[PDB]
Design a protein around this nucleic acid. Sequence first.
RNA 1: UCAGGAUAGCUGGAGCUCGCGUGCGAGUUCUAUCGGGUAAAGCCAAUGAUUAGAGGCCUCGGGGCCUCGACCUAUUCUCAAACUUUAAAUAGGUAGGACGGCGCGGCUGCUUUGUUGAGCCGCGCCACGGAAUCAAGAGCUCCAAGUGGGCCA
RNA 2: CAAAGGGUGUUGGUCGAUUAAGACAGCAGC
RNA 3: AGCUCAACGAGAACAGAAAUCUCGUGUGGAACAGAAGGGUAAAAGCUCGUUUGAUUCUGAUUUCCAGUACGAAUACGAACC
RNA 4: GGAUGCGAUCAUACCAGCACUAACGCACCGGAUCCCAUCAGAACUCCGAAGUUAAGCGUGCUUGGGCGAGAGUAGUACUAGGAUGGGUGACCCCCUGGGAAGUCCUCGUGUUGCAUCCCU
Lengths: 278, 46, 160, 207, 49, 163
Amino acid sequence: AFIKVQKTRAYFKRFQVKFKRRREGKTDYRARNRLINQDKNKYNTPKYRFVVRFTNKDIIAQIVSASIAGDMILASAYANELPHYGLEVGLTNYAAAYCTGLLLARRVLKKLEMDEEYEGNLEVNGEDYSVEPAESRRPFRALLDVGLLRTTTGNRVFGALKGALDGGLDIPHSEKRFAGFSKDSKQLDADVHRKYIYGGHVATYMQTLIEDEPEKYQTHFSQYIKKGFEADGLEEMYKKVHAAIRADPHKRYNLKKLTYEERKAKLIERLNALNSAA
Amino acid sequence: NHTAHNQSYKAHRNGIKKPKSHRHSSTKGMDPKFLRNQRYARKHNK
Amino acid sequence: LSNPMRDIKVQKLVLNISVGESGDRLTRAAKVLEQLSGQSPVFSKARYTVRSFGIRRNEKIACYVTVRGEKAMQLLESGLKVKEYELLRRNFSETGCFGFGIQEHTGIYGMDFYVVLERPGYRVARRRRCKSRVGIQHRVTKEDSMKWFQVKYEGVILNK
Amino acid sequence: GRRPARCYRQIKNKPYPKSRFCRGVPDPKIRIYDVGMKKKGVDEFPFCVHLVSWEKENVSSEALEAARIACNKYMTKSAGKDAFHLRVRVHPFHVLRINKGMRGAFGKPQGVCARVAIGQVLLSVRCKDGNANHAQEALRRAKFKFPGRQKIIVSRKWGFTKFSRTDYLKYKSENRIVPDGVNAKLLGCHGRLAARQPGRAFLEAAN
Amino acid sequence: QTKKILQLLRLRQIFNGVFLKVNKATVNMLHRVEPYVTYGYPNLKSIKE
Amino acid sequence: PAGHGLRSRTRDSFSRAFRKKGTIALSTYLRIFKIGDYVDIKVNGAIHKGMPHKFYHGRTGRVWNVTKRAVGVEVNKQVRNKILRKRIHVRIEHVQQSRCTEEVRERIKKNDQLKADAKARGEVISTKRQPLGPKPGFMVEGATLETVTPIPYDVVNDLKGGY
RNA sequence: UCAGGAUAGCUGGAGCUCGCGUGCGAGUUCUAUCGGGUAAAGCCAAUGAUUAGAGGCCUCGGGGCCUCGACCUAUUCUCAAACUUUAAAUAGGUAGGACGGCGCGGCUGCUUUGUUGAGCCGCGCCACGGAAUCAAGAGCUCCAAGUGGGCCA
RNA sequence: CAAAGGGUGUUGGUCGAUUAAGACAGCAGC
RNA sequence: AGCUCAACGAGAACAGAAAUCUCGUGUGGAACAGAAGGGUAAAAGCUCGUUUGAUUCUGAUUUCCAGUACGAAUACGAACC
RNA sequence: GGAUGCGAUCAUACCAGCACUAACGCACCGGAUCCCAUCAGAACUCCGAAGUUAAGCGUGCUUGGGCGAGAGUAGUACUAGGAUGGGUGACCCCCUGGGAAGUCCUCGUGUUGCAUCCCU
Ligand SMILES: [K+]
Ligand SMILES: [K+]
Ligand SMILES: [K+]
Ligand SMILES: [K+]
Ligand SMILES: [K+]
Ligand SMILES: [K+]
Ligand SMILES: [K+]
Ligand SMILES: [K+]
Ligand SMILES: [Mg+2]
Ligand SMILES: [Mg+2]
Ligand SMILES: [Mg+2]
Ligand SMILES: [Mg+2]
Ligand SMILES: [Mg+2]
Ligand SMILES: [Mg+2]
Ligand SMILES: [Mg+2]
Ligand SMILES: [Mg+2]
Ligand SMILES: [Mg+2]
Ligand SMILES: [Mg+2]
Ligand SMILES: [Mg+2]
Ligand SMILES: [Mg+2]
Ligand SMILES: [Mg+2]
Ligand SMILES: [Mg+2]
Ligand SMILES: [Mg+2]
Ligand SMILES: [Mg+2]
Ligand SMILES: [Mg+2]
Ligand SMILES: [Mg+2]
């Protein structure tokens, strides 16, 4: 039978729209509120967020502070600009996330004129690292803002966290989510964690396909092959990229709103046509 | 049982009395962490 | 309209066996799905106690399993083959879905076959971030599902 | 039995309608508010006359039914069973209490009444121009059934519609009137254009 | 309220009189003691006498 | 206590505004509060912690302390023949920065420069504001005069839209 | 505990500290700004109550293809101390300088990536009194009486 | 203290009808 | 941490008004121990993980109010989680 | 002129239908060795770059609903103060002041911060 209209006038009159970022599915305001809310007895003390976002083909890293007018960007780093340093492929894997985090850490310290005091971790062995405080200056402190992704063990976001930590930034964290951590043993395996930092897992998969499915290897890694990158050569590439990062870190096509006169004129034409009908 | 009749008249005989306001107010009830540091700051003031 | 991204495909196949009571029968019924589908089924519990049906609340009375991929196609043709590749015109829902039921298939249990058809791009309504709605023109309609069944299995639709 | 109406004539308490707080309320004496040919079209009865209240008082449901019956009978005889439409414009929603010493004197519900204001219409009758005299006379008899002072006012509107008789003909001649039984709908220049009919689409509002 | 306003106008006794400058502040005060006073625009003769 | 709970008679005062429920905008948490600032107390019904008693709702006070999540506020309260300086702590969700003194700071600077400019020229002046005074005389150009007269009475018009 | 008492308020006495119009006080207004859910209003907005027809009449029941009622759409009469989108008048809070402002220095164990903040301190400079009206003045303390049946508009 | 409701008591007012082409009353044969 | 409820619409052997399963709409019309009111939707609701801040030490403030106590609540400080 | 990341304001930003988009993007999308994840690689997670702008995102349109603003409703309803005012009463006029809200009507359909990139 006829069904009562669910979305009547009354439904829209009492409807309250959520925040634009919420209904666009991009901001978790419960998390955002607890990230930016500063103690009132600290007054105008910025609370910086280490924002890491992953797209289908790029990694975005930013140091952000909140303000009434909006968020202010202190420093930013994109994985798409890593080719300037040497990394040409796999710009969204665990190793690329580590490079992006490292680049941001060196850039922000460069802007703050404190990169000389904090050189970060010099022996990347996969162990948990935290830059020790200097003599006359504490390390820059930031908070990780993971966004709407799932914080699973081995997630790329924690790969970028390790890069930022190795770059000399103080970021509160624990080792329970770095790649190589074991749920049962409750310990961090440095060898496995170091393997992911240099793309060892990517190299292992490349070798597995070659021995078993050479046809699949050609397609699954076409860009790697197109640029002469081998599985055994990935570790040396990333180590070179890390050293490079530390060395130096209008025509309109959319329609325009019709004016009142134009809209009225078209309305008259439709009105007359309807009247002339029948 | 109850009534407020005449009570406003009684209050205004000598009121309404506002409390005496001094330049310096008591620090009791303020953040002890802030107060303790302020005491040290005055101690070494020169 | 002929874009490759508009091709219809079977999103998943769901086999539901509502035995209507716990005990040995439910355990045996679950084993049928596990061997027929190759994966562990789920045990559904009654939402409300009903004395007429003899089911108590929070009691396992049914079991179902979801199958995707080639095995869904392999296990779907078998069901249609038993059905003689004929379905009633009312078996197709307005949201581009259809289903049927077999009563022959431990013992003998009647199964419930339901098929969900979706075009590529339905992830927009399933992903956690930037969750949205599939465009109306891109959704699979009742007519589209019928044509897919009439070309995928050259079946017949009986209005009756 | 029931107290004389003078006991609850004056509006002294806040509205006390039937609800989950006031239970055991007897039903109103009046249950029918429309009498006569209530299915007649809007274009059948142009004339309209009202019995307007001129006091702020309570009107019992018993009096409302008595006025309706008295008005209905005379109009039926004088004009006919299918020559008028009588509508009672007042509904009794206020509950009256009765305390059957003064300890715990909050009374039980006795009956219902209507809280009428000054200038509020009590009864309305629409018919043809030829039966205007009968309609006014029928309302005169109903006046004796009410406690206060009322007044007979001949409406300048077309029947029970909200349009003046001059405006109703003006709009109807322009084809802007869509009959809706006893009501009349005025067509504007809003809404989906396809919803309108060839001869019922306009560029400007009816002014 | 009236008692306070009349005190501010220095009208503490019946038939006492005073001058008052015209401005929104004073006019609004005077509006609140209207039934207790009568006033107007004095001419030069009245002010002299 | 003694016949009334803490939130008695707060059905309307503590309820959220129509179509303004749910998430609290984060500009509330970005406000900076200093000692001596004036704030208006407006209870937010969603935040149940650090909320002031219903009396302080709709009152303006002066900030006398700042904590991690709350500000100490001084509010005048009349008890019989005395005014009491009530000191309460309130979470910042229930306080709005008041604009009662917004004109003071800007007014002082204007007064200071006006006196400074007048001092150099040896002309004593006054920077005090004054209420609206009487208007001066002026001429109004003649125009067409519309005559207004009382309207004859009509009973049919004694109702919104007429009878 | 209910014909009582104590307690606070109202009252007297005793003063004391100052002040003389430059008052920092006011049962008043002005200016700026903040809170409200009563009156009215609303149902053609949620919740609840409630009258009538009109169209569609797909689908459900009712009876005899017909047919009444359920249903759907657009309208319509009349309502609410314990309903409400909206929303007064009156009344309520705060502010209108010398306890102001600026400049240069200093202190800290608190705070910051950071002499970054926060508060405080020292010195120098500026500050025609920073709306109206009134101000038989303002503040502070001590001891204590009576009263704690009210009534009228 | 006084009500609903009434008066061809009397005084004002409002709307309509009739009338020197002859109304109204009476008289006369419409 | 993930999830979204009541209700309705359209579909599926036994299966129907009402068992389970699928899609769609769904501002909360559900739920949140109890009275009512208020409040809450990537939650304060539902399902899981880990747990004992239902801990130790004072003082301050609010409500009651004589600006006494008790009960209850709130904001900090110093510890341990 | 726009997109993207983070945002501010939280409908002029929402809902419905229809139409449209250069480049870089953002997406859909391929795969399931490894981390992770479930009945289910759908989701989540990891790796990838063959295909497509079909959807999403973006923009425009609708005598669309809603929302926002104005006009009007109306000096109406109500209301502070005043009268040895009217009236049997109910209630109401006048005096000194303040002053709303549906329907109807017209118009509008976001604005904007930081950073990166395309148009170049
Ligand atoms: K009468
Ligand atoms: K009570
Ligand atoms: K209203
Ligand atoms: K209603
Ligand atoms: K006593
Ligand atoms: K008379
Ligand atoms: K949660
Ligand atoms: K659903
Ligand atoms: Mg979270
Ligand atoms: Mg009473
Ligand atoms: Mg007690
Ligand atoms: Mg009390
Ligand atoms: Mg005695
Ligand atoms: Mg005493
Ligand atoms: Mg106000
Ligand atoms: Mg109230
Ligand atoms: Mg109310
Ligand atoms: Mg009312
Ligand atoms: Mg006695
Ligand atoms: Mg007594
Ligand atoms: Mg009489
Ligand atoms: Mg409750
Ligand atoms: Mg507690
Ligand atoms: Mg996949
Ligand atoms: Mg497209
Ligand atoms: Mg519109």
